[PDB]
Amino acid sequence: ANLRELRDRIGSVKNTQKITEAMKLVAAAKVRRAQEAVVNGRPFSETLVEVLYNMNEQLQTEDVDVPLTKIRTVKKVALMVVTGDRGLCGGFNNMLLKKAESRIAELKKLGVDYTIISIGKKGNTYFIRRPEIPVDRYFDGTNLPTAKEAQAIADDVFSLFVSEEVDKVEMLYTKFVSLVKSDPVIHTLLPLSPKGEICDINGKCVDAAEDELFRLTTKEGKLTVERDMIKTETPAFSPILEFEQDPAQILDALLPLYLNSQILRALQESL
Amino acid sequence: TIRNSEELRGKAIEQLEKARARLKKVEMDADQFRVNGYSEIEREKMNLINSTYKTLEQFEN
Amino acid sequence: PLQTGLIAIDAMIPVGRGQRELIIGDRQTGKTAVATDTILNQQGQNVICVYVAIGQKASSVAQVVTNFQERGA
Amino acid sequence: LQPRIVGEEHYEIAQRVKETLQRYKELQDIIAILGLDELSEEDRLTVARARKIERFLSQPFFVAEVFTGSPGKYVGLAETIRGFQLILSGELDSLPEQAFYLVGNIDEATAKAMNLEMESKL
Amino acid sequence: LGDFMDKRDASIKEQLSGVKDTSSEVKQLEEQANAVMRAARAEISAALNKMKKETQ
Amino acid sequence: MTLNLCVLTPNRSIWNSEVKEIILSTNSGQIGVLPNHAPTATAVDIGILRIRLNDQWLTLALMGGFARIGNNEITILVNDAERGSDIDPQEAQQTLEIAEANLRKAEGKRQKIEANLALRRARTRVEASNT
Amino acid sequence: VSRVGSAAQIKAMKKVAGKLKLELAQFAELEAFAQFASDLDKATQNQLARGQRLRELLKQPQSAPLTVEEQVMTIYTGTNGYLDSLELDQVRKYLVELRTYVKTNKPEFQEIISSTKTFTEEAEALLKEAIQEQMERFLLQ
Numbered sequence: 001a002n003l004r005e006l007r008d009r010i011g012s013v014k015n016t017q018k019i020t021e022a023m024k025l026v027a028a029a030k031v032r033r034a035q036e037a038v039v040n041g042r043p044f045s046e047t048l049v050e051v052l053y054n055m056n057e058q059l060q061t062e063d064v065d066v067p068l069t070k071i072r073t074v075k076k077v078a079l080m081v082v083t084g085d086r087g088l089c090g091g092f093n094n095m096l097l098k099k100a101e102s103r104i105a106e107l108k109k110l111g112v113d114y115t116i117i118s119i120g121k122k123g124n125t126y127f128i129r130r131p132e133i134p135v136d137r138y139f140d141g142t143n144l145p146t147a148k149e150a151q152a153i154a155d156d157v158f159s160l161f162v163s164e165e166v167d168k169v170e171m172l173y174t175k176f177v178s179l180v181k182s183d184p185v186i187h188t189l190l191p192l193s194p195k196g197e198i199c200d201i202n203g204k205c206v207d208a209a210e211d212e213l214f215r216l217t218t219k220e221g222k223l224t225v226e227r228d229m230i231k232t233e234t235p236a237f238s239p240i241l242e243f244e245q246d247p248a249q250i251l252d253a254l255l256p257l258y259l260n261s262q263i264l265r266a267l268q269e270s271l
Numbered sequence: 272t273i274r275n276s277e278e279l280r281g282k283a284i285e286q287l288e289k290a291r292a293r294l295k296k297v298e299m300d301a302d303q304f305r306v307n308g309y310s311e312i313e314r315e316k317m318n319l320i321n322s323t324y325k326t327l328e329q330f331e332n
Numbered sequence: 333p334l335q336t337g338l339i340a341i342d343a344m345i346p347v348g349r350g351q352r353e354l355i356i357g358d359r360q361t362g363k364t365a366v367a368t369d370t371i372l373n374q375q376g377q378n379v380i381c382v383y384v385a386i387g388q389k390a391s392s393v394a395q396v397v398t399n400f401q402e403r404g405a
Numbered sequence: 406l407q408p409r410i411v412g413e414e415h416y417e418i419a420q421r422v423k424e425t426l427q428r429y430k431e432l433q434d435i436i437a438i439l440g441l442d443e444l445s446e447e448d449r450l451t452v453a454r455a456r457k458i459e460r461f462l463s464q465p466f467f468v469a470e471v472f473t474g475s476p477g478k479y480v481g482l483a484e485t486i487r488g489f490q491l492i493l494s495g496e497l498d499s500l501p502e503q504a505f506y507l508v509g510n511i512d513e514a515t516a517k518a519m520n521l522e523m524e525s526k527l
Numbered sequence: 528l529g530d531f532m533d534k535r536d537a538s539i540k541e542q543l544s545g546v547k548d549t550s551s552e553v554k555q556l557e558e559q560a561n562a563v564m565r566a567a568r569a570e571i572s573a574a575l576n577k578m579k580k581e582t583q
Numbered sequence: 584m585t586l587n588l589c590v591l592t593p594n595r596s597i598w599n600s601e602v603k604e605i606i607l608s609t610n611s612g613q614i615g616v617l618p619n620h621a622p623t624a625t626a627v628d629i630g631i632l633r634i635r636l637n638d639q640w641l642t643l644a645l646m647g648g649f650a651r652i653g654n655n656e657i658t659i660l661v662n663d664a665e666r667g668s669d670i671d672p673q674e675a676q677q678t679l680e681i682a683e684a685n686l687r688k689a690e691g692k693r694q695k696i697e698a699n700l701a702l703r704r705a706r707t708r709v710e711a712s713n714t
Numbered sequence: 715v716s717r718v719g720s721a722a723q724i725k726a727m728k729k730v731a732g733k734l735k736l737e738l739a740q741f742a743e744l745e746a747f748a749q750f751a752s753d754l755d756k757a758t759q760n761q762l763a764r765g766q767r768l769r770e771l772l773k774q775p776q777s778a779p780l781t782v783e784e785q786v787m788t789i790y791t792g793t794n795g796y797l798d799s800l801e802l803d804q805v806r807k808y809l810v811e812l813r814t815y816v817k818t819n820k821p822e823f824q825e826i827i828s829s830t831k832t833f834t835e836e837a838e839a840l841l842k843e844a845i846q847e848q849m850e851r852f853l854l855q
């Protein structure tokens with residue numbers, strides 16, 4: 001009974017090929033849904049950045065003093081890592097946690113007293129199995145990432161920074177720039193410029209080459225993605241707004257929206 | 272408000288009355304349909320009580 | 333048409349009068365059941381059915397023929 | 406194993422057991438190469454119930470206590486039907502898999518589960 | 528001068544009370560309209576099975 | 584017959600229909616807007632945005648944000664705005680009791696602000712789900 | 715396979731057989747996508763559900779052969795979708811009750827399927843009426 005063994009093995013390989021191409025196609029459909037979510041959530045942040053840019057051009061000579069936008073250089077660090085939910089992952093979570101190790105390596109060497117806010121299920125599994133690194137909160141993806149995950153992460157990061165305990169809350173994630181290569185980036189989140197741009201870990205305004213609104217088009221017969229420069233932004237005009245609220249309180253109520261916007265877009269891009 | 276409210280309560284109470292008459296029809300429907308269906312279930316039963324003698328004769332030959 | 337009574341055969345793999353159709357399968361998958369369902373289904377139509385039990389167990393053939401006599405086929 | 410011979414409850418529980426085991430036999434390669442964690446909610450339940458059923462089909466014999474190291478058990482038909490009905494109804498989903506291993510009946514399965522939970526707490 | 532508007536508002540009061548008890552009666556009467564045929568159909572199959580036992 | 588109103592959470596536009604009378608719970612208190620309001624760009628606290636469809640008065644459940652009044656094209660950028668009333672108050676009070684409970688255990692300095700904001704969001708949830 | 719093909723069917727059977735064959739082929743195509751039925755298009759979910767409730771009417775018990783009119787009405791109901799709303803543990807019971815009901819109440823359908831051996835428009839109308847009636851009587855439970 002060896003020929004039935006080989007027949008059943010061939011049948012198992014046929015079924016495994018079938019289910020792997022099924023996983024490929026449904027993952028492509030969910031990539032399409034993720035780009036839908038991204039380009040649908042964009043214009044909120046478009047109007048937010050135009051409002052905030054106008055407001056901060058009217059508020060430079062002032063004293064604004066909002067706790068999110070202050071610069072407290074006494075150098076603590078809160079690096080937040082977001083990873084993949086489920087497995088097979090290509091090489092996602094491994095290179096993410098590897099850059100996490102490299103960043104905490106340069107951090108601990110400078111004695112900056114780092115900490116970790118893990119978001120993904122694979123990442124938080126890695127961190128509970130390795131307790132030699134300190135970690136603050138745990139999150140997951142059974143809860144929907146489009147609203148509630150991002151809201152909880154924004155609540156925790158706001159409660160970490162406004163209660164002025166740690167400085168330099170940055171987020172390590174993976175912007176979708178290519179279908180084969182996905183190099184992670186480290187962007188700061190809360191120690192923000194009052195002008196309101198995304199910055200690098202150096203601060204050198206990576207909104208210059210952020211390349212919003214990725215889309216998927218085939219080139220010849222294989223799937224690729226296209227990323228252009230600028231789309232449907234109207235930031236220029238600055239009409240009279242007649243502030244009823246005190247101007248410091250206006251930005252004090254505006255900046256949490258920008259926190260939520262950035263956290264949500266980073267979650268969607270890593271997804 | 273008074274025309275629309277009296278209209279609402281009137282239409283709803285007439286709904287009570289007409290669906291009450293319809294309830295009478297459904298009560299009679301269930302009673303009559305049980306009176307019918309008793310006969311058909313007894314029919315299939317007596318089909319069995321005859322078919323036992325039928326197969327008895329079929330093997331008697 | 334040859335009505336086999338099984339809806340899956342009558343719609344997907346139809347059998348005609350004068351066709352020779354193979355009930356091929358593994359052991360104990362329902363081949364005798366399919367043949368017996370066809371022979372029982374031939375009650376209304378006037379088809380003279382023949383069942384050739386080749387090398388079967390004698391009590392198996394006894395069960396088949398008692399099922400035939402019970403159903404009236 | 407035909408309804409008119411064996412009783413409708415017997416036939417239905419046997420058909421359900423066999424369908425669950427066949428579905429577990431077919432999930433065997435989507436599990437072993439693609440991950441049990443990513444499975445759906447109905448299929449994970451099917452897998453757990455099939456593992457529990459497969460453990461419950463084992464039974465120590467009186468002439469095989471020299472191999473099993475445990476006394477044999479006579480299991481009548483009714484307690485078998487009731488046990489498999491309990492297993493695939495959804496009541497015993499909180500028992501460990503080893504509670505069903507080499508037990509006579511379903512009350513013995515629950516008793517072995519109790520002893521397992523005792524060893525697990527202390 | 529008070530009871531004249533008391534009456535005009537008490538009309539809306541009795542109206543809303545009537546519609547409330549009305550909706551309660553609607554759900555109850557539709558429940559009974561389902562229930563009479565449901566009881567007939569269930570008990571007829573009950574007696575079917577019970578007499579069928581003695582028939583077998 | 585009124586100004587254009589668009590309530591916009593981060594992920595989506597909730598609803599962009601126009602209604603008559605809006606009470607906007609700011610950081611400075613409640614303020615009513617009119618059709619053909621002169622442009623006032625204010626803030627919005629974790630509170631209650633009540634609307635009026637000129638046929639019925641309705642409340643909207645939001646967890647903060649920012650508002651802008653323009654030339655009858657007003658935009659309110661909110662944090663978490665659930666349309667109308669999607670919840671019933673029993674689970675709301677089941678969240679109120681647990682938020683006030685965890686306020687005690689969450690006693691560290693950051694947990695003060697965190698539990699306080701969770702409380703201000705549970706309170707606006709229940710006072711929005713009253714109707 | 716059947717190398718004779720549709721020439722071995724009556725004229726009534728071919729009309730429902732074509733749709734049954736196409737829908738069963740689509741289900742056989744999409745059978746791999748059943749574990750990811752949640753993350754799919756609505757048309758794909760429809761084809762998957764239609765497939766897994768068309769598989770349920772191809773089940774039969776031993777020694778209970780359907781006549782050609784009963785299977786014409788069964789294939790018609792399934793392939794149009796007058797059971798696309800029921801649950802998988804209800805399709806077989808509903809079809810048994812419907813077949814017995816139609817055979818008992820609407821013999822014009824059996825006569826037009828048997829004497830003319832075609833799926834006439836009058837048979838279609840009678841079957842839709844009987845489907846609606848048994849749908850009400852079975853929603854009564």
Ligand SMILES: Nc1ncnc2c1ncn2[C@@H]1O[C@H](COP(=O)(O)OP(=O)(O)OP(=O)(O)O)[C@@H](O)[C@H]1O
Pocket residue numbers: 358359360361362363364365366406407774775776
């Ligand atoms: N359509 C059916 N519904 C229910 N049970 C069935 C059906 N078809 C077959 N069976 C059951 O399957 C078992 C085997 O049936 P059958 O004898 O037809 O298979 P077989 O291939 O002839 O067996 P063998 O390989 O020994 O000749 C029987 O117990 C029968 O009751």
